[PDB]
Write a protein that binds this ligand. Structure first.
Ligand code: RET
Ligand code: LFA
Ligand code: LFA
Ligand code: LFA
Ligand code: LFA
Ligand code: LFA
Ligand code: LFA
Ligand code: LFA
Ligand code: LFA
Ligand code: LFA
Ligand code: LFA
Ligand code: LFA
Ligand code: LFA
Ligand code: LFA
Ligand code: NA
Length: 269
């Protein structure tokens, strides 16, 4: 029995991490929060560039950046605090005098950010036949549920793969519903805007679809080559944390930038 849970800790306690793996992950997580702070300033500075009626979107972007910056900063500190060099072996191992790697930071970020990200498109596009309040409530419920059930799942990642995957499947149910509602919102948003605006919404959809699907990918990452597999290792920890960071930048900053551009193109008409 290996007291330690979560996958980063398990690897850290048994295998350890190479200098490369440890340093790379550290730098990736740092770039994570660096990009959010630059984003925060961007959304603040450019708020004036869009008409009053759209500005709640820029605002929500900014607030997402605040939470993303704070919690990803915490996550990065959590990484370097949690693993420590052994001279004998020449790898980084779980430090028992540290606090242990904790996914809580990222998952809290998700609980806060997912509702706002879904919400903020409703202040740029106009629905047609759907009700603002119906779409909102559906986003908020399914979003909360998606993150909550995921978080439950993630506890069993090492200890009970069955629970890990089942909770993850439930989570994916809510995910699918979100995709379905977002697609409706984007299709309705395309009616009665310039072709320029339609083109940007097409790109938002693609970005949204790819970026949000990275998260379940990273969730599953360690297991995507079986238990004997090359990913079931520091390389899976590396890839998971890399993909989470690519997702965060794309789902928050690039998403936000695209919505801003759409808002500007809408005023032009
Ligand atoms: C800015 C952060 C965002 C947009 C986070 C999004 C997170 C997800 C879409 C998570 C989805 C998950 C599943 C669909 C299954 C596995 C558990 C999750 C929470 C990773
Ligand atoms: C016309 C749209 C212009 C796009 C500008 C977007 C700028 C976003 C700034 C955040 C990314 C900066 C990354 C810095 C990391 C170090
Ligand atoms: C008026 C537009 C100003 C754009 C500045 C972008 C700031 C980048 C953050 C670093
Ligand atoms: C208007 C376009 C603003 C460009 C912002 C460039 C971001 C550079 C981030 C480095 C800090
Ligand atoms: C465009 C008008 C902005 C109103 C913000 C209402 C959102 C409240 C969220 C609770
Ligand atoms: C709504 C934006 C406020 C950000 C709250 C996020 C909590 C910060 C915790 C930092 C890490 C401890
Ligand atoms: C303004 C949109 C509603 C989301 C608020 C943040 C949710 C808190 C999660 C705990
Ligand atoms: C459903 C997601 C809720 C996440 C709550 C976990 C918050 C933990 C904050 C970091 C833990 C530090 C110890
Ligand atoms: C998509 C329908 C999924 C049904 C299962 C609902 C389970 C609720 C999760 C409990 C959270 C505590
Ligand atoms: C065909 C149009 C491609 C531009 C849309 C955005 C591309 C997806 C971004 C992937 C995020 C990683
Ligand atoms: C033509 C504009 C397309 C905007 C999508 C940008 C996404 C970049 C992905 C890397
Ligand atoms: C169907 C949308 C395509 C998104 C592909 C990204 C998901 C793969 C997970 C990466 C690891
Ligand atoms: C909704 C489930 C998304 C997981 C995609 C990851 C599959 C990668 C295939 C290799
Ligand atoms: C005319 C449409 C232009 C939209 C381009 C949006 C590009 C977003 C740039 C933010 C990406 C930051 C990632 C930097 C990592 C280093
Ligand atoms: Na350390």
């Amino acid at each position: 029995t290996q007291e330690l849970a979560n996958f980063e800790n398990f690897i850290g306690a048994t295998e350890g991490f190479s200098e490369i793996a440890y340093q790379f992950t550290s730098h990736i997580l740092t770039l994570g929060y660096a990009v959010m702070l630059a984003g925060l300033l961007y959304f603040i500075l450019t708020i004036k560039n869009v008409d009053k009626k759209f500005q709640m979107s820029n605002i929500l972007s900014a607030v997402v950046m605040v939470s993303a910056f704070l919690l990803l900063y915490a996550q990065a500190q959590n990484w370097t605090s949690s693993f420590t060099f052994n001279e004998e072996v020449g790898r980084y191992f779980l430090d028992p005098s540290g606090d242990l790697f904790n996914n809580g930071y990222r998952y809290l970020n998700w609980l806060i950010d997912v509702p706002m990200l879904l919400f903020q498109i409703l202040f740029v596009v106009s629905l047609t036949t759907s009700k603002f309040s119906s779409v909102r409530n559906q986003f908020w419920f399914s979003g909360a549920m998606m993150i909550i059930t995921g978080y439950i799942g993630q506890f069993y990642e090492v200890s009970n793969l069955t629970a890990f995957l089942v909770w993850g499947a439930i989570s994916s149910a809510f995910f699918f519903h979100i995709l379905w509602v977002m697609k409706k919102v984007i299709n309705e948003g395309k009616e009665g805007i310039s072709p320029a605006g339609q083109k940007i919404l097409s790109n938002i959809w693609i970005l949204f679809l790819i970026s949000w699907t990275l998260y379940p990918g990273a969730y599953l990452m360690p297991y995507l080559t079986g238990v004997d597999g090359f990913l079931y290792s520091e390389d899976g920890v590396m890839a998971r944390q890399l993909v989470y960071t690519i997702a965060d930048v794309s789902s928050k900053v690039i998403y936000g930038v695209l919505l801003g551009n759409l808002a500007i193109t809408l005023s032009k008409n």
